[PDB]
Amino acid sequence: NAQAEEFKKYLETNGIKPKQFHKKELIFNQWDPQEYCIFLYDGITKLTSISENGTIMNLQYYKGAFVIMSGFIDTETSVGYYNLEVISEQATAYVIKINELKELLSKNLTHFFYVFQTLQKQVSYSLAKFNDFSINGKLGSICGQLLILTYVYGKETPDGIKITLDNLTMQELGYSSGIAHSSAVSRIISKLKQEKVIVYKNSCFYVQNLDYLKRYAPKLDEWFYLACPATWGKLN
Amino acid sequence: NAQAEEFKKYLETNGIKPKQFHKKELIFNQWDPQEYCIFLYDGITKLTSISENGTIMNLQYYKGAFVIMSGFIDTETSVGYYNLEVISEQATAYVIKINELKELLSKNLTHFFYVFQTLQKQVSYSLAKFNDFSINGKLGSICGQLLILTYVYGKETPDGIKITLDNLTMQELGYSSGIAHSSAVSRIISKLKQEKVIVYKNSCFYVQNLDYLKRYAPKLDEWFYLACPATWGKLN
DNA sequence: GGTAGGCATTAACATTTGTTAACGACGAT
DNA sequence: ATCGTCGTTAACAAATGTTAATGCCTAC
């Protein structure tokens, strides 16, 4: 929003200025660790991780204007080895390198408070996500994940709320729930067709009972009501 | 932590007096206190959430010098409704009104980078924990939770390493994962002495093959070394 | 108006958790 | 003495890790 836009035009007086990233490119990865502060101005990405085993995990989706750190400021070392994979067709991102960031945030306080705000939104997001996922099984982890995407990328239509996102493979949907196999997801996904809360037509997910999803993930719905009110209010 | 000691003195030069809370007291609360910045100087505490029915959830343990926040910096609204509950002897904590924080941080960049660092150490922490817990099921959750409890609260004794806490009822180990009955958790710890990794004595937990834990929660073990090296180094 | 991989669906088992119910001791009012 | 607390087990009801085989698709 407004705050995001002036951070945008804060960086551009200071000689760091965007880079186009395209689908499946990695702004940074878990094998070649460079420590950045990524200001993703526009587009859609996902934070992933491969293990010494090939087991994939979709931690989180970053969208719109947001900030992703790969380095600590005061120590300038890595925070953990992850992947910021682009999902949208294109994405603009401001790749600030970490031992630059302190001097930048020092000379303007309005914009540190911005990044501080987002990292606050992030701490509260993870805790919420962790809470609702951990209580009742993978089914909860699915309903939680669906509800997230349904709020962030959901659109109105006379057959339900559309999760308008590239091609959310069911294997990918399980990847956010820490699931290895599509069959485990297919089984769950249409307990949610029969219970009439989810349909899968046009190879895209349509939500029918938002109140169902809310019950299985109340801490997250709360997080939206508090940290992203404008979004939360579109679907009420 | 030498960085926090300066922050305590910094608070005291501003008339911020420490308050003493003591076992099972709630510094801030699920039914909106709020919102404060909580500088926890000494003691041990836990962050919990109670659902509408009665299902409880132990999201994180906070210990020693750390800083919690229930409010966003700029808007001073809630970041979510949780409980900070004193688990230990009786913690010492500086409770700062949030409106007072932005001003306090605005005029001493050193401490204001310090707060940012702590908040970076938990966005990283939360993510790592989300990862190891989501994969490898709830057995992996217990082991991952055992893991962080050793690194933080672990002495090494001629009987392995002692998880040196109060009274960690397996009811409570339980609340760290999402396992809501104390018999399911008992079926786990059971299976971990039979495999020689933990022994239950003196109403306290001991770990003697910590290597077994590090495989079930690798990105947690990776997180300590990366984020909290001094803590990691004492067991490696 | 035709091909080959890529997923979704669904079945059949192998384990892991969820749940309830007795039984038994420690520790505190 | 009489708690409520906590740990421990067996016994089961679901839940979900797996793998395999059958089909509809769409990128090509």
Author numbering:
A (entry chain B), B (entry chain A): 2 to 237
Paper lines:
The complex contains one PrfA dimer bound to one dsDNA molecule and exhibits an intramolecular 2-fold pseudosymmetry. Each PrfA monomer consists of an N-terminal domain (aa 1–108), a long α-helical linker (aa 109–1137), and a helix-loop-helix-containing C-terminal domain (aa 138–1237). The overall DNA bend is ~45° in the PrfA-DNA complex, which is significantly different from the previously reported bend values of approx. 80° to 90° for Crp-DNA and CprK-DNA complexes. The second helix of the helix-loop-helix motif penetrates into the major groove of the DNA, with S184 and R188 forming direct hydrogen bonds with the bases of T20 and G18, respectively. The majority of the intermolecular contacts are between PrfA and the sugar-phosphate backbone of the DNA. We observed a DNA-induced conformational change of PrfA by comparing the structures of PrfA in free and DNA bound states. The conformation of PrfA in the PrfA-DNA and PrfA-DNA-GSH complexes is similar to the constitutively active mutant PrfAG145S in free state, consistent with the previous prediction that PrfAG145S mutant adopts an induced conformation.
In relation to pathogenesis, the expression of most virulence genes in L. monocytogenes is regulated by the master regulator PrfA, which is a member of the Crp/Fnr family of site-specific DNA-binding transcription regulators. PrfA activates transcription by binding to a palindromic promoter element termed the PrfA box (tTAACanntGTtAa). Very recently, glutathione (GSH), either generated by bacteria or derived from host cells, was found to be the essential small molecule cofactor of PrfA through allosteric binding to the protein. In this study, we determined the crystal structures of PrfA-DNA binary and PrfA-DNA-GSH ternary complexes, thereby providing new insights into the mechanism of PrfA-mediated gene regulation.
